[PDB]
Amino acid sequence: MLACPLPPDEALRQQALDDMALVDTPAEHYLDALVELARETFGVKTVLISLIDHDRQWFKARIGLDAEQTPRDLSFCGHAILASEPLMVTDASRDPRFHDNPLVTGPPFIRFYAGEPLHASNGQAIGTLCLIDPSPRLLDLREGRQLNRLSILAEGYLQLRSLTEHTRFLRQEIDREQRKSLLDPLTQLWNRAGFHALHQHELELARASDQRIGIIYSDIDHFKRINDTLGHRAGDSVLREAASRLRAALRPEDLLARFGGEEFVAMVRVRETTELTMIANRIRELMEATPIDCAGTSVPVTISAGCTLAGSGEEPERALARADAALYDAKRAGRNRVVSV
Amino acid sequence: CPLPPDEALRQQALDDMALVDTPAEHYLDALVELARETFGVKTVLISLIDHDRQWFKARIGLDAEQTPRDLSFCGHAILASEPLMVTDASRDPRFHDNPLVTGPPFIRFYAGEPLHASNGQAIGTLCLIDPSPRLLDLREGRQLNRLSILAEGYLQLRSLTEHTRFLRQEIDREQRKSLLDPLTQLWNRAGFHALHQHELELARASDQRIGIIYSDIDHFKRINDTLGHRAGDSVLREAASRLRAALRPEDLLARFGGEEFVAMVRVRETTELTMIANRIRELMEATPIDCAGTSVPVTISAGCTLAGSGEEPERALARADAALYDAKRAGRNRVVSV
């Protein structure tokens, strides 16, 4: 048995996770909010929704951590899925399981870990919701409950998510292995090819419920500047938060993708044109509501957006170019604004 | 109560979620409990503004299933994009007249964040309510906000699920009023009847077995007789909450009598079914149910069986009901499988 031991029913466990079309999918607003809420609740530095996938720990949501994944053998969560009860570690530098672990030895010098297992509907433990911090800590029992509740909310959402048409499309038409081509792991959105694989099914769902398809074409204002002026690390932080604020402006049924370097395209299902502009406005207000922290330095960032509704029978590529022309208008007219066409 | 120009559309966006007059959901129940525990408040509601009433999809610390819309805080709250924060409803010009302020439960503190449909229409509210004046931190206000974001996300995702999509097609908002037991917030027998067929179709289409768990709270009569009706009611509400917490979002749960609950579940084979039946029994046995401060130990008997292929649903029901009675004779607090 490895440095992180496998449950005897590993095969079945990995299968409950595969049937959820979850590993290698984009961040979701709701889970982002949940980890943020957890962090704020307890005051810890890091919070993860970590999924145990073959020999890695892959993060569906995170906060206070830049890594997109970790080998299973380096994980705490990999031990936490081995039991029904929460894995509490008061001080990992003193714990036989983790005092050797490079994440305890080296950065981020994990001391406190509190991990609460997440399950598929069949009871199989697919991963964890966890708090992580560089100072020793022991949750009182009230905190234990809050954390427990927080973990029920995570599971809840994951399980419902597997009862949706997006998830059926994902497992039935997009091999868990193809899914890796389709995802920009920096912003945790679908990429250009990800959008391409999904845009059709999106139109199909709009037609079935008499909805319009609207396209929002956006672009971070003055990205080159911040990226050259401050580190390229600061750039990546700006890309990470912009993507997160974009996901918060959308609804769970929307399709959002990173397209070029600093540009993002949403395809939304709306009743009619004002709903679409509302969404685009919302995207722009969220981006502008606060600065974006870049390692202590707060950086004002705005976005421009062009948007349009796709006509009945219109080639999506055409609707797309129209939104892009509207975005070009938005930039020309002064940036930090939305043009609707 | 002041209502928006776009009341027609707001209402329509709510109606499209197939949401008013539906059963409590475990996840929403966990969420309001999280809220209650986080703020140390007496009452938390997920409140939906529906025509002339205010109906609760989830509630802790409050027994009414709905209240009238007019003079009610939430009909006022949706009207703005911002939280409605009332420090003391009794000294507030808008609300001191309100019967839930001057009569029970003597509301004073109120904090409500609007909840939205996909299109932005405000369909209701997540709110904290307490009989003592209070005013929130910006930190706390921001936590309430993230909780309201979660409730709103859940309700929008729920709207995209197979079952909810089915409810939008088949069972109109009019039919649903009579399919729901108000006290336990579960489907009643009429609900179960309206929905069980659709659950056979899912099981067929996905090569699955159908399982029935037929369960009965133990010594119920004794409880009412010892501690009165209100303590019987406490036991029901809470027992239903645990029924929902031990099953899974896609399972059909219903109240089948004064003290009986029935669950229909899709599963692989027998082992899995008995496992779920035992998860319920455990979960109910795991802690005393609180009644007016006095804690009451509540246990549960249950029978279960799989429905053979093509077996008439009623036959399987009858067999699990027989199995529940074996469990009772064998000493209660247990599951018998057949």
Amino acid at A114: A
d(CA A249, CA A32): 12
Under the phi-then-psi rule, with left for phi > 0, alpha for psi from -120 to 50, and beta for the rest, what region is B166? alpha
Contact B37 A142 (CB under 8 A): yes
Cβ burial of B208 (10 Å; 0-12, 13-18, 19+) is: middle
Pairs from B163-166 (Cβ < 8 Å, separation ≥ 24): B163/A163, B163/B250, B164/B17, B164/B18, B166/B198
Tokens of B127: 């709110």
- Best B6, B115, B118 member to test A by mutation, with max A CBs in 10 Å, is B118
Percentages of chain A per state (helix, strand, coil), in multiples of 5: 45, 25, 35
Nearest-Å Rg of the Cα atoms of chain B is 21
Packing angle of the helix pair B26-39, B138-158 (nearest 10 deg): 180
User: Which of B162, B259, B285, B311 is the catalytic position?
Assistant: B259
Place of tokens 């609950």: B261
Taking alpha carbons only, the member of B117, B108, B111 closest to residue B142 is: B111
Q: Under an 8 Å CB criterion, which residues of A touch B?
A: 29-30, 33-34, 36-37, 40-41, 121-123, 142, 145-146, 149-150, 152-153, 156-157, 159-161, 163-166, 251-253, 270-271, 275, 278
B243-258 as b/e: b if 16+ CB within 10 A = bbbbbbbbbbbbbbee
Tokens of B243: 């029924």
The CA distance from B79 to the nearest CA of chain A, in Å, is 17
Taking alpha carbons only, the member of A261, A285, A80, A284 closest to residue A186 is: A261
Residue set of the binding site of A for 3',3'-c-di-GMP: 251, 254, 269, 271, 282
Selecting from B139, B146, B158 the residue whose C-beta is nearest the C-beta of A36 gives: B146
Place of tokens 């349009």: A308
d(CA B31, CA B13): 23
d(CA A31, CA B44): 22
Selecting from A37, A145, A159 the residue whose C-beta is nearest the C-beta of B143 gives: A37
If one counts every other C-beta atom within 10 angstroms of the C-beta of residue B40, the result is 10
d(CA B61, CA B227): 20
Residue of A nearest to B40 (CA): A142
Contact B27 A251 (CB under 8 A): no
If one counts every other C-beta atom within 10 angstroms of the C-beta of residue B10, the result is 21
The CA distance from B278 to the nearest CA of chain A, in Å, is 13
B139 interaction partners in chain A (CB closer than 8 Å): 40
HSE, side-chain direction, 13 A CA sphere, residue A224: 1
Selecting from B37, B142, B156 the residue whose C-beta is nearest the C-beta of A251 gives: B156
B25 sits in which H/E element:
none
A43-67 as b/e: b if 16+ CB within 10 A = ebbbbbbbbbbeebbbbbbbbbbee
Tokens of A14: 């990995």
Selecting from A153, A165, A253 the residue whose C-beta is nearest the C-beta of B27 gives: A153
HSE, side-chain direction, 13 A CA sphere, residue A313: 0
Instruction: Reply yes or no: is the peptide bond before residue B249 cis, omega within 30 of 0.
Output: no
If one counts every other C-beta atom within 10 angstroms of the C-beta of residue A162, the result is 21
d(CA A242, CA B100): 44
Q: What is the DSSP string of B4-22?
A: -TTHHHHHHHHHTT--TT-
Task: Show Cβ contacts of residue B119 under 8 Å, excluding neighbours closer than 6 positions.
Answer: A270, A271, A275, A278, B13
Tokens of A224: 């080159």
Tokens of B283: 């979960």
Sheet holding A189-191, edge to edge: A183-184, A189-191, A255-258, A263-270, A212-220, A303-309, A338-340
Taking alpha carbons only, the member of B289, B134, B304, B119 closest to residue B210 is: B304
CA distances from B147 to A129, A250, B57, B115 (A): 17, 17, 15, 10
Question: Is A262 a residue of the active site?
Answer: yes
Across chain B, which distance is largest between two alpha carbons, in Å?
Answer: 64
Contact B143 A33 (CB under 8 A): no
If one counts every other C-beta atom within 10 angstroms of the C-beta of residue A160, the result is 24
Task: Show Cβ contacts of residue B302 under 8 Å, excluding neighbours closer than 6 positions.
Answer: B213, B214, B215, B216, B277, B280, B281, B324, B327, B334, B335, B336
B162 interaction partners in chain A (CB closer than 8 Å): 163-164
Amino acid at B275: M
User: Which of A262, A263, A288, A314 is the catalytic position?
Assistant: A262
d(CA A44, CA B137): 19
The CA distance from A162 to the nearest CA of chain B, in Å, is 8
Selecting from A33, A146, A160 the residue whose C-beta is nearest the C-beta of B161 gives: A160
d(CA A104, CA A239): 28
Task: Show Cβ contacts of residue B175 under 8 Å, excluding neighbours closer than 6 positions.
Answer: B194
Tokens of B6: 């776009």
Could you list the beta-strand ranges (E) of B66-140. Answer: 66-68, 84-86, 109-116, 122-130
3-state secondary structure of B209: strand
Contact B119 A150 (CB under 8 A): no
d(CA A293, CA B102): 48
Experiment used for this model: X-ray
d(CA B309, CA A277): 52
8-state DSSP, B247:
S
Contact B120 A271 (CB under 8 A): no
Contact A252 B163 (CB under 8 A): no
Amino acid at B78: I
Q: With beta carbons less than 8 A apart as the criterion, state whether B304 and B280 touch.
A: no
Q: Are strands A303-309 and A212-220 parallel, antiparallel or unpaired?
A: antiparallel
Runs of H (alpha helix) within chain B: 7-15, 26-39, 73-77, 99-102, 138-158, 162-169, 173-176, 189-205, 220-227, 229-246, 270-285, 313-329
A193 sits in which H/E element:
helix A192-208
Could you list the beta-strand ranges (E) of chain A. Answer: 46-53, 56-63, 69-71, 87-89, 112-119, 125-133, 183-184, 189-191, 212-220, 255-258, 263-270, 292-294, 297-299, 303-309, 338-340
Place of tokens 């129940």: B29
A93-102 as b/e: b if 16+ CB within 10 A = eebeebeebe
Q: Which domains does chain B have, with CATH numbers?
A: 1-183 (no CATH), 184-338 (3.30.70.270)
The CA distance from A143 to the nearest CA of chain B, in Å, is 9
d(CA B151, CA B115): 7
